[PDB]
Amino acid sequence: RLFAPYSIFKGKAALSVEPVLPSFTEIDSGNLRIDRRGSLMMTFMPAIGERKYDWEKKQKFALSPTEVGSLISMGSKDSSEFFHDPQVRKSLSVKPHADGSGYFISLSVNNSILKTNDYFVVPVTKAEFAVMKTAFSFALPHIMGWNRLTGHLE
Amino acid sequence: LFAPYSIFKGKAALSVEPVLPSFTEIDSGNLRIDRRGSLMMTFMPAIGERKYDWEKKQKFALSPTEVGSLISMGSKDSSEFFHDPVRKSLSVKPHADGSGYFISLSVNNSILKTNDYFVVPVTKAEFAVMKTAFSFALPHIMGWN
Amino acid sequence: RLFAPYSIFKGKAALSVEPVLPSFTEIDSGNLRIDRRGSLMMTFMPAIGERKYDWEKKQKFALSPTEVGSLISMGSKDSSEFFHDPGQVRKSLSVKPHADGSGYFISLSVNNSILKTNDYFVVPVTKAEFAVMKTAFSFALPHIMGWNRLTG
Amino acid sequence: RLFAPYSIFKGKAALSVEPVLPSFTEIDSGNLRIDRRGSLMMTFMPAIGERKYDWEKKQKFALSPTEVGSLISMGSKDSSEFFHDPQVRKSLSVKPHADGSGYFISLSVNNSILKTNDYFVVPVTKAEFAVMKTAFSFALPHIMGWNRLTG
């Protein structure tokens, strides 16, 4: 595995984004296989002070191709909100600042079972969101499988 | 084979996937025949809630120029493509509020005297996937990759 | 071939476009640099009749990366015009929009000698066709700049 | 190894731009991570009269992916300004002409150690900036290492 997330580190939280290509991976001598669907994976972690973050407390939100399209389609005055009920319930919000200078990206996680509620917010500048739209656009066909790695091409 | 991008709606479903250029050699072979790519749209009618009839699927292949038409569409634009002679046409018409489009396929069989209309709403997000995927595919279907 | 030309065939002329990659030369230290720049080669040829074109009369115009930039950045109300001059004669290429925003007309002017009337080849290009051009040209731009070689 | 800058030569200076890829290094368990970040390298040099430039007095400014995003997202009336500390202070500005015909791109280098400073200004046309935006957009996922993820 190569890791190359695009990461943004801010006051209350950090956000890392990275494509997940569809894959089927053997481990444990072949007894177990890990099947991953194509997505754009967003990972949030909370700040703990002195400019550091708690990796062990990270929470994720996986964007489908359609959800990626939602983000790519946003201009400076647009919003997106996504709800995943995979009893853990997650909400991702991308909301623009009034001056068009960027967005708050937040993730809300509700665990009815453990009675917990977690919230992570990261501001993203216009420049940072431009990186996301460009990189996400690049990655989208690959997450959809439109290539030689996943496509059945010789 | 590529996994299609599919949209499943109330009355019909739409799937889209690229078809690469293919080549064959003839005349010994002094002629190389290069078959242009397309973006293939496949429509199926609903038979229940989120159920569709695969046996009744209908295809519409977009040329590079027709793909250009779609990628160039803003939130207030329309496109309509006519293929003939069976006779088919494809329209992309915007919702007044700018939140998406209807993408609709008309199929007229003159043999059997039927006219079938497959209508699929597409959200802004879903059309953005198409525009991005199609823009990616366009150089490949043109043979510029 | 590496690039199959995109062609548009219309009433008075036809237009074909294809990338030409840059050449490299090794210099000192085993290092390689661009020798001759890449371009987007546009080939125009006039109509002789009913969708038939005179290939013997083809004329070419090589767009530089910067000129390709000019085209890709055009909106529906913009025009572009490029003038080339130091075997090679003076040529100019223009892209002008129809007032209704439905598309453009692309014109190549070839200035011949004082004994020879100039040649003018004009090809209308619809919004859809120009979208194919901008998309394909954007794709080709880093290749004609040699940037694809700076990566995988 | 192979060099392929996009270069703009103007009255007072020239600008060359070129991507620099990240490097990936193996860690534990066969996994690879980025040990050197990618950038978009901007190289400025001074005009020395005639139509020539002092290729040996070049000065550089390395844009991060985020700084590349700043430029890609600029419209004809937008500005960008970046401040770097590698004291050697450097600032890069991209400021629009009022008529929307292009920009000035300038590099300021404040050399506190040598107690000097340099200044390069390169006008860029709309077309030239469009090349930059398109080429930078192409290069961005490569400088971020995402081409390696997607294969």
Which token pair is B123?
């959200």
Question: Structural domain of residue D63, as residue ranges?
Answer: 1-151
DSSP element (H, E) containing A134: helix A126-143
Contacts D73 to A, Cβ<8 Å = 126-127, 129-130
Domain count, chain D: 1
One-letter amino acid of C148: N
Rounded Cα gap, residues A125 and D22, in angstroms: 23
Q: What φ, ψ does residue B78 adopt, rounded to 5°? A: -125, 155
Cross-strand bridge partners of residue A152? none
Tokens of A71: 């983000």
Any contact of D with C, at least 3 CB pairs below 8 A? Answer: yes
Resolution in A: 1.8
**Does the beta carbon of A72 lie under 8 angstroms from any beta carbon of chain D?**
no
Alpha helices in chain C (DSSP H): 65-72, 127-144
Phi-psi region of A49 (alpha: psi -120 to 50; beta: other; left: phi over 0): left
**Nearest Cβ partner of D2 from C73, C138, C150?**
C150
Query: D26 - beta bridge partners?
Result: D32
Strands C32-34 and D2-3: what pairing?
parallel
At residue A128, what are phi and psi to the nearest 5 degrees? Answer: -60, -40
Chain-centroid distance, C-alpha C141: 12
Q: Rounded to whole angstroms, how far apart are CA atoms C101 and C99?
A: 5
Helix A126-143 with D65-72: angle, nearest 10 deg: 100
DSSP H/E element including B68: helix B64-71
Q: Indicate the pairing of strand A6-9 with strand A13-20.
A: antiparallel
In this structure, what token pair is assigned to residue D81? Answer: 């300004």
Select from C97, C138, C136, C150 the least CA-distant residue to C17: C136
Reduced to 3 states (helix: H, G, I; strand: E, B; else coil), residue A57 is helix
Residues pairing with A131 in the sheet: none
- Determination approach: X-ray
CATH number at residue D116: 2.30.31.10
Residues whose CB falls within 8 Å of the CB of residue D89, separated by 6 or more in sequence, listed in order = D83, D108, D109, D110, D112
CA dihedral sign, ordered B40, B45, B47, B50: positive
Using CA atoms, how far apart are residues A99 and A76, in angstroms rounded to an integer?
9
Contact (Cβ atoms closer than 8 angstroms) between residue B135 and residue A138? no
D80-84: strand order across its sheet: D80-84, D88-96, D102-111, D116-125
Separation in Å, CA of C61 to nearest CA in chain B: 19
Extract the runs of DSSP E, i.e. beta strands, from chain A.
6-9, 13-20, 23-27, 32-36, 39-49, 52-53, 59-63, 80-84, 88-96, 102-111, 116-125
Nearest-CB residue to A18 (from D66, D140, D149): D149
Contacts of C146 in chain D (CB under 8 A): 2, 4
**Any idea which residue has 């991976």 for tokens?**
A25
B90: its two tokens: 């494809």
Closest CA to D39 of D128, D107, D140: D140
Q: Report how many Cβ contacts below 8 Å link chain A to chain D.
A: 79
